Design a binder for this molecule. Structure first.
Ligand code: SF4
Length: 277
């Protein structure tokens, strides 16, 4: 009987879904089952799945994302700095989608991912918040590295998104592209150029994962995290997390040492884990 992906009618998952799954897996599950409850604007517009230019078909929305990538790649390779870079790729049988906030080259020529976290109150981030945030930026590197190394193909995206390449691209898509100097023929031709540009433009793997916490008003830095990426640990975690989404195990609540997370959880009054873990 249905897996959570089928039950919640999810064709793919967002990077933040797995980040909040690190906070509480049951809370993330309830967030998909009961969505009626529950700034980087491109990532926020991706979570509600809005898009940059008029949003009719899903082939149009993905075509816009592909045109953005084709422009951001040479911008990064010449200006050394870009923002809001879309990432996607199949991870353990599930397509993962996200938006990297900032990519730039350090003075030593290292490709650095920057993740800025603003806070209302000038308080240090919790250990549980840093665990989750470190997992999020590690996922960005996991997907990005696979993208620029040729491990993410147009076929894999079509399989999960059910994009139709027979449907021609809308005028708002073709207008956005021609105004950028590029003439898209078909969605299939666009996807093939994205693959080429991702893999043949000398894009290195991400060298630095940097998280910065800032108090908004005073601009005071509340901490800086240089994430120690270990790909074997990262893969083990997504394997475990995707095992729930694909339906191979039951969702888990928080550990008893972190029962304080339930104090401000929307679904505390219906969670059976909160009663008997
Ligand atoms: S009440 Fe606690 S265990 Fe249950 S979903 Fe919320 S955070 Fe998770």
């Amino acid at each position: 009987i249905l897996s959570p992906m089928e039950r919640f009618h999810l064709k793919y998952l967002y990077v933040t879904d797995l980040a909040t799954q690190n906070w509480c897996e049951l809370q993330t599950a309830y967030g998909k089952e009961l969505p009626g409850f529950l700034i980087h604007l491109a990532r926020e517009l991706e979570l509600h799945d809005l898009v940059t230019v008029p949003v009719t078909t899903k082939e149009d929305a993905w075509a816009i994302k592909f045109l953005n990538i084709l422009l951001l790649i040479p911008t990064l390779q010449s200006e050394g700095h870009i923002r809001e870079f879309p990432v996607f790729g199949e991870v353990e049988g599930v397509l993962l989608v996200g938006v990297i906030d900032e990519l730039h080259y350090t003075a030593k020529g290292e490709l650095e991912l920057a993740e800025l976290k603003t806070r209302r109150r000038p308080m240090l981030p919790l250990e549980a918040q840093k665990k989750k945030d470190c997992f999020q930026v590690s996922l960005y590197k996991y997907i990005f590295d696979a993208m620029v190394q040729g491990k993410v193909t147009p076929a894999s995206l079509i399989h999960h998104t059910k994009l139709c390449l027979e449907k021609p691209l809308g005028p708002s898509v073709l207008r956005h592209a021609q105004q950028g100097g590029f003439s898209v023929k078909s969605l299939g031709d666009l996807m093939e150029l994205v693959f080429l540009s991702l893999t043949l433009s000398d894009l290195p793997v991400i060298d630095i994962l940097k998280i910065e916490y800032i108090h908004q008003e005073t601009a005071t830095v509340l901490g800086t995290e240089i994430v120690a990426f270990k790909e074997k640990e990262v893969r083990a975690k997504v394997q475990h997390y995707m095992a729930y989404w694909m339906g191979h195990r039951e969702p888990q609540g928080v550990d008893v040492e972190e029962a304080w997370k339930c104090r401000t959880c929307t679904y505390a009054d219906i969670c059976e884990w909160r009663k008997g873990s």
